[PDB]
Design a protein around this ligand. Sequence first.
Ligand SMILES: O=C(O)[C@@]1(O)C[C@@H](O)[C@@H](O)[C@@H]([C@H](O)CO)O1
Ligand SMILES: [Mg+2]
Lengths: 121, 112
Amino acid sequence: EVQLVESGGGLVQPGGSLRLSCATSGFTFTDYYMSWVRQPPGKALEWLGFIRNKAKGYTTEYSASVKGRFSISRDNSQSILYLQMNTLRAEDSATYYCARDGYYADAMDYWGQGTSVTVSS
Amino acid sequence: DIVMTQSPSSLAVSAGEKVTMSCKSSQSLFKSRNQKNYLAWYQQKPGQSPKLLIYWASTRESGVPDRFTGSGSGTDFTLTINGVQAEDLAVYYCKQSYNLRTFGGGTKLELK
Ligand SMILES: O=C(O)[C@@]1(O)C[C@@H](O)[C@@H](O)[C@@H]([C@H](O)CO)O1
Ligand SMILES: [Mg+2]
């Protein structure tokens, strides 16, 4: 049974940074890419980035909307994914989701419950 | 950068009807090499975790009811729900996975 659980969301000052965590279980973590997606209040889902699997050497890619501001990493000894969020603005207020991804289906097949992030001074 | 356009923004039908919605992509999402469209459909019921419905334009994800059918190829796609259930109230997104990933603006399915 696949489980993904985001945590670490909360209130953050504009300009500040937050680290989101996504703990995983139920599958061979290193076999898969992991993506981060968000849904701001009233707005469409927006893909932010991914980190690839072991076979691809765990490299990263980003949306133009966050590239240079957000950074993704994983601790494979813990089967844990991270989103390092920096230089946050009001528009980054949203629910953040991690999702299992990859070149097997070129699709995000399992998603966590999400963590909420509000950027407000 | 690939532009994903969904029509309409919102629509409503009654429980038990058929609906269809459209997804168009600025660039063909098909590769001849493996004969796949890099296009998937997701469902996000309001206020909760999205769910994968369809990948490769037409392959229904494990667990998904056969109510749901994705069709089309290249730049032109549609999702059809043949017999809408109350459970189906959600925004439906198409998403290209040809080059990174980009979601469309969604189509909100309301019920009458
Ligand atoms: O960027 C990738 O690693 C990946 O392999 C992900 C696939 O889902 C697919 O997007 C693929 C591109 O089509 C390039 O082959 O790239
Ligand atoms: Mg029913």
